[PDB]
Design a protein around this nucleic acid. Structure first.
Lengths: 148, 199, 265
RNA sequence: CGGUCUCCUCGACUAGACGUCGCUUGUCCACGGACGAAAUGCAGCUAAGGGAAGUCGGCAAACUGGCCGUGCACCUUUGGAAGAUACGGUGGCUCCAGAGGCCAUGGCUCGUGUGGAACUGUUGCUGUGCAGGGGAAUCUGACUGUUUAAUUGAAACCCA
RNA sequence: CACCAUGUUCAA
RNA sequence: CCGUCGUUGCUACCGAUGGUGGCUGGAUAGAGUCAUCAGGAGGUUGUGGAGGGCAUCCCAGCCGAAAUUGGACGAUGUCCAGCCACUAGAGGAAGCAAAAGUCGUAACAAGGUUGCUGUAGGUGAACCUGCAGCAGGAUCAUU
RNA sequence: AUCCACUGCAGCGAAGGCGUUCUGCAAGUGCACGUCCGUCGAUCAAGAAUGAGAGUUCGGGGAGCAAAGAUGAUCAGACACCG
RNA sequence: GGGCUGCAGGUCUGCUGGGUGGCCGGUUUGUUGUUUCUCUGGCCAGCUGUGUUGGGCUGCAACGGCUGGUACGUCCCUGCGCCCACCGAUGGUGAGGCUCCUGCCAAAAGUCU
RNA sequence: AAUCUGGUUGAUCCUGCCAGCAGUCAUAUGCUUUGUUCAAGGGCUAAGCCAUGCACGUCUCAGCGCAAACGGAGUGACAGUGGAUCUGUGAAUGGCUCCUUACAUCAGCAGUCAUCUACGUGAUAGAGUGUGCUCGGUCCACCUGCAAGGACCCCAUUGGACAUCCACCAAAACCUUGUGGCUAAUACACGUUCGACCCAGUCAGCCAUGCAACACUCGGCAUCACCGGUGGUGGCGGAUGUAUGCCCAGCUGAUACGAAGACCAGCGGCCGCAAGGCCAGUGUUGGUUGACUCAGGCUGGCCCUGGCCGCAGUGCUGGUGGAUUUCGUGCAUGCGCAUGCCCCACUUGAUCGCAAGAGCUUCUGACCUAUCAGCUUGACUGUGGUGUAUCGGACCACAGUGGCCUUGACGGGUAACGGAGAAUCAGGGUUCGAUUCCGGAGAGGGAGCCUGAGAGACGGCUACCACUACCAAGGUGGGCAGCAGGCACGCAAAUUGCCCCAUGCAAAGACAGUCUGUGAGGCAGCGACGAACAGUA
């Protein structure tokens, strides 16, 4: 789906040298066909998707297979829509308490969040997304878990 | 001057942003180097930066250090010409050296080097040492040895023009270093060159 | 036009310096030395306001540039040198020998000490890195480097350095049961043994401490300071209340009794 | 030099049965010649500085002019006004994209039809012929159509 | 069940 | 007690025709600077040779100003468009206020034609009339 | 054109509104019930559908009544009540 | 859920309409009298002891002065104390680890029955 | 103090407002005003305009002293003081103001694993270095260079300027300026042996021993061909001993769950005289984080005689002061022979942290307005680059069609700088906050820059605009929303004061001999803003 990229350049992974004569088994994964893949385990109590570890897609701005570090807030939202490429709109309906009238308001916030190609998701699924460096004008969060 | 801030860039909504300050120096930009491939002399202008540090605008570079990744060689190899760029052909036409542009380089080193190292002559040319014979045959008999069919078909023409990709940012370090393409990236860019030679 | 600010207003001064708000518009802005600006005493405050040798700013400059105020075994002539926690301040012409510590109220007191107590210092490891040529070092809270520590000296430990040689003499682990002192937050200046460390990966771990008598408080792991392997072996002399904070009714009664028994004469 | 019925109708530029030039066909016939050829005239052009001060009256001439892109106000019978007003571009060359068809994803044909870029020139390109000046009101006839062949084309007649 | 309009200003 | 009408004053509205100020956007020309392409005034070192060290020359090198080309940033002028704010106006038309001006008596009683509502027409002014409704009516009530 | 009397502390309709008889057309409420579904509901900016009479539009109709108008009285006036 | 062994009151049980004071619990305040105990400085027996002066501290102690003079067991209710229902885990390494047990058979008696 | 009272009527009870009553660290004003102590004070309007003066300079023993400027004193390089000057460093802080600005600023929270850094502080630091050598520089050799070959030299420390000064001066001036001659460095340029040693590695050679007739070759012939050479294992070694930053590429930066055999090569060890069999021994590579492509480390980045690079950088100064005894053997040991020692500070610079800052970024939280309902087209995402200190449409090229919106988008308004806070406040709340502390913005409006660690600086420069000052008409200038002060504008707001005594800041700088500066700040003057305590008996 979004594993597809442009055919204007040869998209390779940064830290994997594809023409190594005698490479090591450090990135030979325990379920792959010998395909070497650099990945990491972001470590705030999250699990690296098997799709990321054993996949073929190339994604900078992916938190598992690229230099993008997850640090800062980690929020929970709902996928409003997926109409950008590898980016997805996420909404947080929260309740803001007005002090004078001792009641609450329905408020919301959207986020252009970056879904890596390691995540299966349908529109409406819940998402936990952690903050990364600015990846675009509005994108500064990566999707760390999709919950059906 | 050239400002890399977003107080002019409208809100993500689409709403205008009213600027109530003027341009700070810490968010300036400088004009692109637009490093040109030039046969002969190199031009490099030092640029005083945010902490009194140096950047090096490469104007008119000629060559650079190019690495043979599988071989760990890194010879200085005199870029011949920009052949492919990822997106815009204007930089290919005007011979602009930018990172990740594909170039033909001399490659008579990595050939004389291949001989010196392995004792293997790649093209019919167009005292002898016992220890040297021994070491060359040892490096031949090592494990991962073997020249690939896409690299030797290039190193076997009498005027080598090997395909490298530029890895440095010449407008930032004043260098046109890079790496020779090997395997699937070589096949990719050779296929692009085929496509635009035939179409 | 903006760069680094050079002044510190008297109101914006750290409150743990009992700076009087009417005695001047400015306060001496600490220099960027070993200790943090809000966890430090300027040498002018130690010389003029506490140990009133200097009657004012001019005489403080005089005393200090005459090169006989020694802080951590070396002379410091900067009137704004940020002397901080666990530093030793000697004045030889006077025979003064202090270690600057925290009282239970969270202020910097100058605890008078003796020979061996002045000939070494106690500093907590905050960072552990490797420099070029494979040199393992450990950056401490006094900002010093200690370019070759013992390999089994992990981060939050404390170290006993000899202020003469500036090398490491001992070190004390941060495991549960160690005697410990608080150096920030509301509970600063209180001494209590470590009971348990609650982990909070990605944020601040919390440390639960049992006071010398039986009280219990909590603080942050970057807020604690190890002093001693246990409540039996403190690696340094300790002030009058020995880090045992009193209740506020107890403190009020203590002040009242002191004032009354003093007025008695 | 007026008028008078129908048929055929090439090439280039072009939107073209406009306009300009050319093959085929036809023709050099209109009373001529000298003299740079007065004044005046009828025609074609220009004109500094000003710009309707000329005149009953901007009459006459001039300005504008094709196409592409952006864009366009009052008022309105909601249809218009509108090409409103206005702004930018336009050559030459070298390229880059871009649509289709046939034989069998290769051979061949293949956008005179578009967009972009680089270079270029004494800033200049609808380079010639051709080719709206525009805006704001009052009176009036709704409109389109009609009209005194040979002084009045109108506000007249007609219309729905 | 013809027609029957009006009453200067403040003060009470 | 209501409405024309009369007097004086104040407030806002409509009004041919305008005026001023500000902001934003576009177009056009474009100061200065930054970057680039050039340039080399001038200053200053060396090459051995032949004159026995002197502008001897040659050949070179280094620094280097003005000027040149040109990308950017962009002041500013002019035009255009939109918007907003303030403001002049012949005339028209309202509202309000001010002891004792004029014409009526519409309303308050069945107010002398019950009153009022919606709409339409007429009229010096209140108002009158039609249609339908209402009682807040002058009827809580008659095979 | 309109459906008197019957015609009411009567009924129906979301309201406006609805009254001779036979008849076509679809509908609603209530009631009865060991029928079905299983929360599918309440109120509602925007939006939508009905909405007396007056008024307008196009084509007919015109008895009666009746704005405007005419007109005779009444009146000080009376393009007011009344005819 | 049954319950209730077991503290106070309530279910129960019989009462109380006497007028002052000092003494004693406790030290309650200005006093003395210690010195438990660090600390201080030398001397003295080859920096440790040993008595000591100075203030610290109170194991406290009195002196005037003192003020302070409802009950057992029984049916259950909470604070707890119990018996009686049915069907997050695991795997490695250390830590500059702790605790307990720890050579052979086993009388009688002991336990599960 | 959980508070009410007067007003509609002939009287009554309500709704409802008006008015009263109270307050304000709100402003203005009228009359009146004795003392002591505190205290706001050109914010509202005109971020309008400014005459004059001052507000940023700085020197120690410790960068440069041949000024006779003052001066002790004698064969002396400089005694000392010392204006000046060059150099360094500061002028980016402070002070003022609130015009702008509506998720903007700001507050609290958080991130930089996306970054920069002068002063400060803790550590650090071994560059004759493009090939093994020729090759740090000269002196000889051999043959399209060599594989082991030599004699010296470098180490008592460089060069050229321009200042102050003298002299001639252009100009009406100008905080405008030319020229000639000396003369300094911690200025500028330039230079670096002994600051290493060893090891890795690179080149070359040699040894011991072993299967073998296979491959590729050196030697003889125009691909059919006949004899040598290299291979495996275990070692030794002659040449050098590639220091570090930036840049590019490759490698590393582990593992923390678990069972046994055969065989063929080699390598060990065991039984072994050996043959041969065999497996009992068996020590001779990893930091940080929650997470990393991070830290750190390794390797390559000279080639076949010119060519190419020249990979830019880093030398604890070719520095300064004070002190003073610098022998290599002085001490000693064992008997001069062999070994451990034989000034202290300051300071230019490089690296790594820390500290102190900054930039950017996160989450949540702002007023009125629908007589503002649709807004946006670099607009939203992506790939590849550029630029930056760094992430990023920040910019570009190519792709796509997104992004926000009645949970109020976009627009408009400012009796909008934000907050800490202020006034009331039973409770809930209402209103304000130009103003001292923090943050932002600005310096007449704009914009562009240089220097520097830091500025889009304005008591810096450049230009345009609006005003404006001097003039000898050619030219030169200006920037009080710093402190006083003036004109305007207004209802409306102070002295053209003294001083660094206190508080601080800066600098090449403790204090004094010998005046560092500071309109920051303090103290005074004016000051019924506003507070507290007394008198007028």
């Amino acid at each position: 789906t979004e594993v597809e990229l442009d055919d204007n350049a040869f998209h390779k992974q940064d830290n994997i040298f594809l023409a190594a004569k005698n490479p090591s088994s450090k990135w030979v994964a325990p379920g792959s066909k010998g395909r070497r893949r650099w990945w990491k385990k972001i470590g705030l109590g999250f699990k690296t998707p098997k799709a990321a570890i054993l996949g073929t897609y190339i994604d900078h701005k992916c938190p598992f297979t690229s230099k993008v570090s997850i640090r800062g807030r980690i929020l929970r939202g709902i996928i409003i829509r997926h109409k950008m490429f590898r980016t997805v709109v996420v909404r947080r309906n929260y309740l803001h308490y007005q002090k004078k009238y001792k009641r609450y308001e329905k408020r919301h916030k959207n986020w252009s969040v970056h879904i890596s190609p390691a995540f299966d998701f349908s529109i409406g699924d819940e998402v936990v997304f952690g903050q990364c460096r600015p990846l675009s004008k509005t994108v500064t969060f990566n999707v760390l878990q999709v919950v059906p | 001057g050239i400002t890399r801030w977003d107080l002019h860039k409208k809100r993500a909504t689409g709403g205008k942003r009213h600027i109530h300050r003027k341009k700070r120096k810490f968010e300036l930009g400088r004009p692109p180097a637009a490093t040109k491939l030039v046969h002969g002399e190199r031009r490099v202008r030092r640029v005083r930066t945010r902490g009194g540090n140096r950047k090096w605008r490469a104007l008119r570079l000629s060559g650079g250090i190019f690495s043979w990744g599988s071989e760990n060689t890194a010879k200085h190899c005199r870029i011949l010409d920009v052949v492919y760029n990822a997106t815009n052909n204007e930089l290919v036409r005007t011979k602009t050296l930018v990172k990740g542009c594909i170039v033909q380089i001399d490659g008579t080193p990595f050939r004389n080097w291949y001989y010196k190292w392995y004792g293997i002559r790649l093209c019919n040319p167009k005292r002898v040492y016992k220890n040297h014979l021994r070491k060359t045959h040892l490096r031949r008999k090592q494990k991962g040895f073997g020249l690939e069919e896409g690299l030797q078909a290039q190193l076997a023409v009498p005027v080598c023009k090997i395909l490298a990709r530029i890895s440095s940012r010449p407008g930032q370090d004043g260098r046109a270093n890079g790496y020779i393409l090997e395997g699937k990236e070589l096949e990719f860019y050779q296929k692009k060159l085929d496509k635009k030679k035939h179409k | 036009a903006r760069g680094p600010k050079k002044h510190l207003k008297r109101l914006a001064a750290p409150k743990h310096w009992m700076m009087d708000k009417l005695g001047g518009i400015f306060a001496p802005k600490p220099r960027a030395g070993p200790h943090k600006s809000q966890q430090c005493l300027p040498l002018i405050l130690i010389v003029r306001n506490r140990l009133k040798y200097a009657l004012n700013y001019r005489e403080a400059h005089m005393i200090l540039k005459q090169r006989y105020v020694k802080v951590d075994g070396k002379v410091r002539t900067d009137i704004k040198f940020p002397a901080g926690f666990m530093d030793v301040i000697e004045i030889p012409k006077t025979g003064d020998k202090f270690r600057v510590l925290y009282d239970t109220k969270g202020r910097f007191i100058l605890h008078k000490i003796k020979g061996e107590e002045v000939d070494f210092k106690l500093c907590k490891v905050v960072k552990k890195g490797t420099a070029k040529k494979e040199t393992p070092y450990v950056v401490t809270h006094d900002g010093r480097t200690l370019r070759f520590p013992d390999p089994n000296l992990k981060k939050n430990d404390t170290v006993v350095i000899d202020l003469k040689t500036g090398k490491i003499k001992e070190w004390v682990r941060f495991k549960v049961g160690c005697l410990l002192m608080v150096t920030s937050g509301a509970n600063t200046g209180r001494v209590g043994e470590l009971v348990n460390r609650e982990r909070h990966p990605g944020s601040f771990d919390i440390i639960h401490l049992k006071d010398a008598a039986d009280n219990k408080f909590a603080t942050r792991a970057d807020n604690v300071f190890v002093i001693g392997s246990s409540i039996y072996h403190p690696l340094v002399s300790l002030p009058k209340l020995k880090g045992v904070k009193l209740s506020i009714v107890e403190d009020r009664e203590k002040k009242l009794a002191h004032n009354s028994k003093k007025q008695k004469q």
